[PDB]
């Protein structure tokens, strides 16, 4: 909330600029506006904010002029638009209903599958903003390359997930090797690496060793973030989190299920194969209870402590010559 | 067919390279292969070929080494991948059934809406190929900018079309101003301008006057191409064309309907408002017949002659200092 204020006020500009002497596309543009208003707003904006906070921590207080700052808030919003893009499109693919307690864009009367083209525009906006605000800067190409690669990392990932978890009831697919691989591609690169990485390029730090080291820390934070994300879906107090859960109820390849699958006598595979993915609550319950009887909440605690220790070693070994404050900023947030 | 041979043999490489020491994404990559094989192949490859033919016509026979040529066949394939991307995604949005006489990707058993992520990968491949083959070249950024802008031109366009023509039976929307605007954004930039424009950049011709002039010729060729595309859907002998038509049968904003709407007594608006968009053949027929009784086939002939004259004036006035052979190559094809 120290720099969240200005970030969200700058949105109104993002839209002003994306929406304008080419008269008869005017209507398409109208609709672009509606799209962004509804789909870019209403999150907690952490990823986009990471770019701003990191940019401030990374630069000479000298070279942080109004223009510099203009570009940090933008490239921050470019990340929130990348996300909206995956989110709109995944929500169609998963046949989701709500998101941020609010009806999904594609479920709205009159949108439906038009949401496909809408998502594509969310993505297109990224590269419009980069041209409008950074075409001049030494790191212009680096930012295009980054976003593009982050998109591809993410898409490869979603493909893996879909292949793993048919919305075709199968647990043989749900392995640790595979789960780590899904999380890395689908959530970790775009959620942890993209934003620090963007800030670094903006700072003129483009050595692929520096990035090699930053990615290493960040990708592991990404694993924890998701593994914690999967724990809370079930056991996390829904008021503390802000969501009912459908990890079991929707045949997801959770961390939970992966670890239960690693730790279960055949007689237990069945009770899981019997009620994982069912709509009935009676069924949703007799997995939860199996998880509880495998002390998995306790196995999570064990992983959280290890993970934590490890992030700090990685920060110790690889943050240099960046301020650890970049990493500890994130670590603080995610280890709540 | 003079240079179509090598173009289609080079595909096999395109795939070899897009699909490879990161072991557990291996499956996602498998699937990418399936995606491209099925969706990049089976067209007539005109747009991608335009890049190759234009590259040859545009360069010093000196500077056309194996490497140069390697990059022309690629950036040609980059265009065929852009198209596959719009095509897969539009075919979902339109609830289409077949395409190239062949079941659409999304209708295949096990694909469905996963086709969304599949289309996104088709698009991602463009930028992988550009990095793999051109990162070094002076025009690398120009080609990224071009493709990105061509994507956005196209998406803006599809948005306009969707807004115009709810798959909501309305003719008031179907105007000439609007039709020209749909065709320009949705089909003309990516089909005519992208490929000549790509070849020019590859040739080191990047002046925005040169491109200003090339786009002018090409966008008008784009209008004709589509306007002819809409004529043939109905009256075009389906063996000469290679498609049954559902321009009327699917409430499309055709050239036909636009011109019939411009030329019709109220008593005729009704007969159109009565049977445009109906599945029944009896209904599909009593529009066709209205079109015939408005001598629209004859109005098409009148437009084809004018259009033709005009393309040549535009070529006369704006081709320089490019070989007219670049433009007359296309004009020859499209004016069949
Ligand atoms: C780079 C980066 C850094 C921090 C975060 C955080 C997300 C988050 C958060 N998420 C919400 C959902 C959620 C995720 C994980 C745990 C609990 C709730 P949403 O996506 O509805 O804003 N909730 C509470 N604190 C945090 S911190 C994300 C990315
Ligand atoms: C830049 C550019 C230049 C020429 C073409 C052509 C397409 C085409 C063509 N299309 C087929 C469909 C069709 C379009 C227009 C008229 C008749 C058929 P498809 O997309 O199944 O390959 N058929 C016959 N000749 C041609 S020439 C496209 C782009
Ligand atoms: Cl400046
Ligand atoms: Cl070379």
PDB file of C-alpha atoms and ligand atoms in Angstrom, chain B residues 65 67 71 137, ligand 4:
ATOM      1  CA  UNK B  65      23.016 -16.929 -50.035  1.00  0.00           C
ATOM      2  CA  UNK B  67      21.309 -18.334 -45.078  1.00  0.00           C
ATOM      3  CA  UNK B  71      15.318 -16.891 -43.420  1.00  0.00           C
ATOM      4  CA  UNK B 137      19.852  -9.467 -38.521  1.00  0.00           C
TER       5      UNK B 137
HETATM    6 CL1  LIG C   4      24.713 -15.068 -42.917  1.00  0.00          CL
END
